[PDB]
Design a binder for this molecule. Structure first.
Ligand SMILES: [Mg+2]
Lengths: 75, 82, 89, 67, 69
RNA sequence: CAGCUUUACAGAUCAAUGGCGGAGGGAGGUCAACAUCAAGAACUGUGGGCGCCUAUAGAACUUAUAACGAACAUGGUUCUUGCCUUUUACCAGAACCAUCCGGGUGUUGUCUCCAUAGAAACAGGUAAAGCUGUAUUUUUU
């Protein structure tokens, strides 16, 4: 068994290709690699990229995204 | 403890209906319930908001999404109230 | 066998301070002392039979109970030829 | 007036409690309802005549039924 | 504190209904008190997979349906 | 400590309305009378559907090592015995039955000793009694 806290600790140490979907949001996705972790689901992401959905690679950098509006993570 | 949530968990086993925030109704045997209404069903018909019925074996739901739950007429009788 | 009115006797002796019990789930059988197949075997008619006489008494008495033995005087023994090899030669 | 501090005053009366309106029904003298310590006193006093056998087992093969 | 009893659904594929009519197929890996589903990623709704191992947030869950019996 | 609800206050307008009203004692008594207490574990009423079935209210007392009594007599009839031999009187067992000494409640009434008010709330305040109260994923940030 793996709780989300432990799977994100794998994503923390690895820093492998993450793709993030967003809460109350279908129009945009993110593509980066997990760098931080809070006690809440707040995670800072370096090498992040704004990726509009397959209904292109748009510009985005390193971001502290407020993690209460997360949907997906996959490193 | 929540006296409506009390009723829900007491209603386990009966053929109960369930509509969510999405408006998609359900109907079948209940299995599990908790403080946060983490509902499970068996033999559940799953009518989409348009009316498209899809019969399925089971389902699990999160309490935040739940709107209202149709309980039978048996829980009217006893024994939660007095 | 020896157990009969054991609870009661114990209670009596103990002045009702000895709530005793008996039971049989182990199925722990054991040899009755004394050896089956003896002629004289025992002493008493009324009194409880001795330790070394016991098995024989139990057998003959039980045969009587079960109606196998003929009258009062009888014996449990082999129904085979050769005079039982002249009684073990 | 120390061990027998409560009953001593009334233990020797025609009707043990003529008044004592709390402890008995009244003067009809039908019912009673003592407090604890006086009951204790009564018990202690009754040591010679009291039943004095708590182990209900004791009457084994000596009950009315047994008889 | 009340742990949602997903040990009946542990190591089984599940059709997770999530925000905006989106679906997630995938075998279950674990969970927490917030219902955040740790699962092996599968094809997302014709159909196409994003990621290998995923962690879905509880707030975004609409439902989760027993694909496997 | 805050909210609500209840009571004793002071005066209130006293509408609003309630409710305690076409408001009416208590404690006892070697005091009565009445009912009634061994029965499918057992009682009674109420409706309804045809003496009964079916839902509804109720039910003091006495009990499950079974009994109103944590107690204990007596009398009768038979049947059996004993002492005997003739009966009473008796022995002590049985089965039946009765009598008696008492008991319980419930209801009436009387007898006694104490009593002895025909109106208080609302707006609050004072004080006291009954509950609740002290955002970062499923309730409300
Ligand atoms: Mg004559």
């Amino acid at each position: 068994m793996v709780p989300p806290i432990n799977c994100i600790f794998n994503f923390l140490q690895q820093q492998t290709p993450v793709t993030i979907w967003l809460f109350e949001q279908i129009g945009i996705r993110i593509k980066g690699k997990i760098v931080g972790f809070d006690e809440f689901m707040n995670v800072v992401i370096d090498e992040a990229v704004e990726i509009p959905v397959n209904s292109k690679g748009t510009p985005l950098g390193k971001i502290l995204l407020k993690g209460d509006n997360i949907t997906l993570i996959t490193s | 403890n929540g006296i409506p949530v009390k009723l829900l968990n007491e209603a386990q086993g009966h053929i109960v209906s369930l509509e969510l925030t999405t408006g998609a109704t359900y109907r079948g045997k209940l299995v599990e319930s908790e403080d946060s209404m983490n509902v499970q069903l068996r033999d559940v018909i799953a009518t989409e908001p348009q009316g498209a019925v899809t019969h399925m074996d089971q389902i699990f739901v999160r309490g935040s999404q739940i709107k209202f739950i149709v309980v039978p007429d048996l829980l009217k009788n006893a024994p939660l109230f007095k | 066998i020896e157990s009969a009115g054991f609870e009661t006797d114990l209670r009596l002796s103990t002045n009702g301070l000895g709530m005793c019990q008996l039971y049989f789930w182990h199925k722990i059988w054991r040899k009755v002392p004394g050896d089956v197949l003896d002629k004289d075997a025992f002493i008493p008619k009324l009194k409880p039979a001795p330790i070394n006489s016991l098995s024989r008494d139990f057998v003959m008495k039980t045969r009587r109970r079960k109606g196998i033995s003929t009258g009062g005087f009888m014996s449990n023994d082999g129904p085979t030829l050769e005079k039982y090899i002249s009684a073990e030669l | 007036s120390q061990d027998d501090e409560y009953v001593k005053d009334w233990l020797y009366d025609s009707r043990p409690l003529e008044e004592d309106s709390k402890k008995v029904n009244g003067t009809s003298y039908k019912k009673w309802s003592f407090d604890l310590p006086e009951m204790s006193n009564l018990y202690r006093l009754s040591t010679p005549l009291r039943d004095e056998v708590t182990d209900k087992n004791y009457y084994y093969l000596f009950d009315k039924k047994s008889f | 504190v009340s742990t949602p009893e997903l040990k009946k659904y542990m190591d089984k594929k599940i059709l997770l209904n999530i925000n905006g009519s989106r679906k997630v197929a995938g075998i279950l890996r674990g969970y927490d008190i917030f219902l955040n589903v740790v699962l092996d990623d599968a094809m997302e709704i014709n159909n196409h997979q994003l990621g290998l191992q995923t962690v879905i947030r509880g707030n975004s869950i609409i439902s989760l349906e027993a694909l496997d019996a």
